[PDB]
Each structure stands twice: as structure tokens, then as C-alpha cells.
């Protein structure tokens, strides 16, 4: 883990969580798209 300093690993974890949450939200908050065949696996 030396090649990347501790701060970068921390912020990597933060951004992984942020991206996962944002993707979940974006894919599955609009009822219009997935209302039919209730529609996305995200």
C-alpha cells in the first residue's frame, strides 16, 4: 500500500461509496422508467 498514500485510500473508499449510492439512486428513483415490468437490477 506504500505506492498510494493513506489519504488516497481513504478518499477512494469515500468515492466508491459515493458512486455506488449515486448509481443506485439515479437508476432507481424515476418511477416512470421502471414502472412497467417492475425494471432495473441496479
Amino acid at each position: 500500500l506504500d505506492p498510494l498514500a493513506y489519504e488516497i485510500w481513504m478518499c477512494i473508499v469515500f468515492a466508491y461509496i459515493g458512486v455506488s449510492v449515486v448509481l443506485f439512486l439515479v437508476s432507481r428513483f424515476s418511477p416512470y422508467e421502471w414502472h412497467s415490468e417492475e425494471s432495473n437490477e441496479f
Binding site: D2, P3, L4, A5
Partner: protein, 48 residues
């Protein structure tokens, strides 16, 4: 350039002396040694 009063008899011998020293390594040796003799800064590594 080494100076001298106009008309001084010492003008010629000093001229020939500097020619001789330039032919010898005295000038180059002195310049190379005095300059860079004790350069403190700088007399690369991989880091995260």
C-alpha cells in the same frame, strides 16, 4: 583582463605570462577547482 598603466614596461611581460599560463592548465585548473569546489546545493527517488 589584467590592467597596467599606459606605457609601463611591465605590460609586455604580464601579457606573455598570461599567454604561458593559458597554455598551461593553471587557468583552467583554477577555474574548475574554485568554481564548484564547495557547492552546497546539489553538491531522483521514487516516493508515494
Amino acid at each position: 583582463g589584467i590592467a597596467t598603466p599606459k606605457g609601463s614596461s611591465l605590460g609586455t611581460p604580464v601579457n606573455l605570462a598570461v599567454l604561458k599560463l593559458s597554455e598551461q592548465g593553471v587557468l583552467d585548473k583554477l577555474k574548475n577547482k574554485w568554481w564548484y569546489d564547495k557547492g552546497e546545493c546539489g553538491a531522483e527517488k521514487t516516493s508515494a
